[PDB]
């Protein structure tokens, strides 16, 4: 059986095919020491990965080797896969085909470089790469739908109808978990919590994943926050400091619908979604107002689905069955879908083999991999 | 018992002989994918037919393999019969003689090619082809009359008297449901509804079949539309958009009487009808001002019969019994007539047999088939 | 003397009648601030036009008020004419009749609204609107020809014979400079150049207008680009970044002949042209294979005329004198033609006057304006 | 005429509006006695300010009530304004509107508390607060630029284009005169000069402001200092001790470009500047590689501008007009700008009045003050 | 095996590596005669060391050649090592590598001079110097912690996390056993015990090391001493005089938390500790509120750990696991740690060799020694 890796921008997710739940999950980041290891007595190393990285942030600089789905640092990137194979899953990569994922319309160079690394350094027997949305759709068995995947690095809308892509209406957005965290960090610095080290950035991420939520009406909840204590929940900073976060718990996520606050010209996810639907033929729009499938951790806010519902119903003509699907498997949907795909017999012919790569090398992927 | 297929230009109609109602009806069109089927997991196909085609327009290009009664794409055409036999009626074509239909004066090549396909690929035991008008006349039992058949592809006038054809006065016209739909599409694009994909073309057809009607006086109803809301009915586009169509609901059908609007030099159906009557001997004109029988879906507009009545009475001398017959079976008249013909015992000698075709092949048909 | 404005979808062109060259040219766009003007000391404004807009893209959102020849934003549209009169040409609109242009079969509402604005707010003494193709034909003095006008917003084919229109064969296409720019933006994002702000969109337009060209054989030049450096010219992004564009320099324009790449079902300009010719009577087709006149900036690619020649000669029967005319005045042809028309004495009776509009208002235009 | 106070983190600067030069300058610090005043005969006091503080350091503890632009000690802070009004300028605060300044993105509480103090205790008639960068830009009349302000407490980069802020690209850094002094104190303690009382800290500041300079190449000048006397200039400690400072004269300022030496993860001013430029749209980057305006005393090192030039030109693409502007008015630029702003007539409507504050109190400022 | 010397400011501690207990301990002081040795008959000498010095204080002047970790008198300093090698341990220094210790941030000159003396005059085969805190941490095996070392000459706080130093948060204080003894001498002189010869100073040290203790509440125990006999313990001066010491038994040590009494501006050890913790990143503060390790004889007061606990818990946020570790090995911790370090095999490559010193001399140490 093959092996599935999502290579999520923010947190790698990996496991054996045919499993409904990912075995291994960890932050797709590396740790580099910035301080002198003068305590010779200990077996220190120049690099750290995942959990170890999280445990040592204050010693380390943190770098995300994936930005906006772009591998900007191949050397450190290799360590993520290296750890995933040799330490985490303890799997010989020569023994299994492997599946990878990428952002749509991602720069063609990187897919080649990725394939090169897989076939050369890990010497995998066979390989394939799929667009995340397709897998995430398989995770719900539907074959008519529109996917919002919103990982740490990108948010993109892909329509799929009866198993066909409509690439002319693929649309992507730079807003994602990372930049949303950056904005949250900014507004928190109107309180004393000014953070801004790469170490503290990761703690803001935790705070967001714990305590943020999406308002059904921005002016309503802003009024309530101006006029009540009740929103101003506490949180325990690791040093035991008590931070109180008010409207910011929602004023941040609001960016996904009014990105102008974040100074991005591109519209929010809802508006982009409507645009993409409208870019498709009128023959299909019905089914694409159904089957709005959320995916990825940025869809893990509470309330977000309701806001999307309300906005889309405000944009669509009435008497249209606007329906949003937000399964609780959202955070692992991509990997679930990949696990499903790898089990199909017919798909077993889809793999690119060692022989094929040897025949034409990386360029071959553009001919079959989608 | 034999089997009857109309092979209508726009929608195939098929069933067993001796039935007063056609069993199977579907659009005589094929669907070709234009977009990549990257969702391997699903069992997609390269071709679609009829209902499936209608259900997937936005994925597909649509092609009518019949134009103006001419089979321009024999390969895709074969699929229509193929579906009709094997899926729709679930009938072995070796077990039944089959009846087909054609436009009058249709190009002699195609009748041969059709016969070749029937006897070679479907290997039918016996075969015959009849001019649509004759069948449509049998559908009303009359044997003195003049038929207007106006399918999707052609409109033609055939007089028949006491069972005899008058081929010297056969007259055909290129105006038909398809080109009338095209014109309707044009004028709608003076509003925002500009459509013009092959997918949307089919929706214009539905709109026409739902909402168009024929004016008894063009200047009258144009004045009223200029001076009232009441004509400007709504329609629900499949995407839930609300389109409001005004005078266009009739300004389109008007083309059948003033084709100059459509830029065709040939006169309208009424004028052509009068011309054809006048081309016959004065011995018969009486009976041919009676027994104007409408046929085919373009005669399915409301009001059309009244307009024809008024025009013909304006052309004919007064004190002539201009009478128009518009049975509600219009839309299926051709197939009804064919079903009737196939039941006659004497007609059972009319069939061309496997033996006869083997004797002389396709050319044989010109000797007996009319 | 009257005044001529093209109101081109992408760039307004204006000047006095009787001039062979347009006096004033600027992008028909408005600029809206998205960022806070906290530097009170400066006299900022809420709106910007043309050159000012180009100079401030990074501050501004850009909106084209013309899409597909449709004025979708009348309020901002008014500013374009307002600037054109009061700042650019410095002309009192009460002192001169004015000529405007529109796409063929453009939605009838907008012509009325335009006339209303001209006679009410600008209070022009007299007014007329002409279809762009007719003017562009006058620009070459011919009176038998077929025009391809391909502005930023639309591309449409109009045949004209001896001064007569054949509206039944008018055909329009949504492909135009804007959507072609969008496609170019897409494929560039396979390299790192992902752009996609409304500001950067305008820079892609410049890049296209500088560096794109049409292949005489797609597979040939694709092979060469796969097998040579020589196509991969450089360009200097305004930030000094060096972008290298390869096959994309032509793979984009190719869309005009294989729009399926752009996911539009409608055929390319060549195929549409052949269709339109075939829609005309055989009496005229000879002259319409001559006198293929290019117009508008999308015809400003190098090589395009040759590709059209080769395609049309592949579609037409041989021994037909396929001839294409691509004067270097292409980019200003429409305005040139308008300048010519306004000088004719007989045309001076064609104008609609203040009196006439007062008599019947906007609806009057449909009776005389073509 | 209004009155302008910078409330600089390290040294208050104050004077009447419309003056090109600040009237009053003194260190924004308070002095508290730590030793018993047993010499009753003298009129001692529990508090000292500015010059008096400087004259008595050895008796006193010194506290900066401003840290990182944050007023951490409002009680002692009040004395700074109190002295400024009543002793220094000898001005009744009821007679003049007053202007104040703050760090960008400074914690929202403090702006309110400041306004409260101004309107309640000083009972000023009207008040306004501006971001330092904006004023410093007005000091050079430019309206396109990027400001580095680097006071004692903060260093922050703000881009401004044509008078518009781009808050999404505002970036701040904790490195500033104070912490740089602390580092200098540290390395001097590798020689005998170990200082580290709050009194001696102030003398290190003087030494820095007299004798430090920025290297154009760190390894070059380190080599020269390892291989020459010539850098090892003398200084006269107030007790007459002779201190010799070598490479430290530059190894300290180097921190602003390699803060890792100071153990801050955030990059240097140059890198941050490039990041901020890149955060702006490509429409404006050209003008922001021009008009790099230095401000505040940390930009008062010799050589710093050249180092910035070299670094930025190393980061920017070549053929970009990297230009740095370092007017000799740097040390007073903020106050100059404020003096200019207060003279503008239109700005006279910008003030918040006693009435407005009474209407809504401190919260009002967030609605108008930027 | 190598040899370990602490060169403690107040008492040298020396022995062979790999021993858990130091072999040799004596006061790091020299004795110089001030009185005429007229009793020729005896073999007197001009110098005395350690025990001999203690036995002859009344004849001698005593000088500490180490002050604040600074070797101020290299000539007399040499005798300490000279005695340590040749008399005390009876070891040839050519036969063993030797380890030394220094205060953090100690003036760079002295480390060089020390190395020079070791390699030149003692001609040791190999040498290394380590910061005291690191060794003292190894003495407890921990590798996350913060060390308070408080010898006779200095008290300094060093954080270490997972074996990494955070030099940016190293902080040192001049308060130490010597100056605390001086203060105790002062307050005793409010009783008759005015001492103040360099001889008597040493007896005050003994009294302190015997009879002082730290109050858990200063005002509490001051009240009790004002209201009870019970604190006023006796001591036997060497001349048999009976001295009674009351609150002074604690009013002295209190200086370490309220140094203002000693007229030092720098805060106490607790406050400095909190400051240092706060100077580290929030990623690590948790572990640094644990693992407060005491070291050196000034941590040998009873009660001190409890006072530190109470203060730190008063400064830290509650629900933080403030834990203090005060092993009874405190007084010898540094030497224990050094003994441990010298046994590690990997450390055996850390030594500087005779060859290396010969290559570059003293300056070499700054490249490897930490
Ligand atoms: N409960 C949550 N609430 C808000 N944001 C979350 C939550 N869980 C995860 N996230 C965000 O989603 C990111 C991961 O999303 P994911 O789809 O896994 O991206 P990728 O697939 O590229 O790793 C996290 O880093 C975080 O920013
Ligand atoms: N109710 C209706 N109103 C107007 N047009 C109709 C209606 N019903 C059918 N049509 C037109 O008639 C066409 C079919 O006519 P038909 O006689 O079946 O042609 P064919 O026999 O060649 O299939 C339809 O495609 C449509 O354009
Ligand atoms: N040299 C060129 N090469 C390619 N495209 C061009 C060139 N010049 C102009 N264009 C395209 O043509 C557009 C303008 O064409 P135009 O006919 O003026 O449209 P309109 O008349 O509606 O303004 C430009 O915005 C650009 O997209
Ligand atoms: N000539 C100089 N060289 C180096 N540093 C200087 C010089 N002059 C001033 N400084 C530093 O700049 C600080 C004051 O800068 P300033 O911009 O006034 O800060 P603020 O505006 O917050 O008072 C001084 O305290 C000192 O540290
Ligand atoms: N039991 C004790 N109580 C109080 N102070 C002590 C005690 N033991 C030692 N000291 C103080 O600690 C000093 C020695 O501490 P130490 O850490 O050895 O300094 P160094 O390491 O520099 O020699 C002694 O000189 C004395 O002042
Ligand atoms: Mg993912
Ligand atoms: Mg039919
Ligand atoms: Mg134009
Ligand atoms: Mg300042
Ligand atoms: Mg010691």
Curated annotation (Swiss-Prot), chains A, B, C, D, E:
Gene that this polypeptide is encoded by: ACT1
Family, similarity comment: Belongs to the actin family.
Keywords assigned: Acetylation, ATP-binding, Cytoplasm, Cytoskeleton, Hydrolase, Nucleotide-binding
Cystine connections: none
One biological process term in Gene Ontology: establishment of cell polarity
Summary of the function given for this chain in its UniProt record: Actins are highly conserved proteins that are involved in various types of cell motility and are ubiquitously expressed in all eukaryotic cells.
Chief place of localization: cytoplasm
The protein's name: Actin
GO cellular component terms attached to this protein's record: actin cortical patch; actin filament; actin filament bundle; cellular bud neck contractile ring; cytosol; extracellular region; fungal biofilm matrix; Ino80 complex
Top-level taxonomic group: Eukaryota
SMART domains, A to Z: ACTIN
Catalytic function, reaction form: ATP + H2O = ADP + phosphate + H(+)
EC number(s) on file: 3.6.4.-
Recorded GO MF terms: ATP binding; ATP hydrolysis activity; identical protein binding; structural constituent of cytoskeleton
Enzyme class: hydrolase
Localization in the cell: Cytoplasm, Cytoskeleton
Matches recorded under PANTHER family: ACTIN
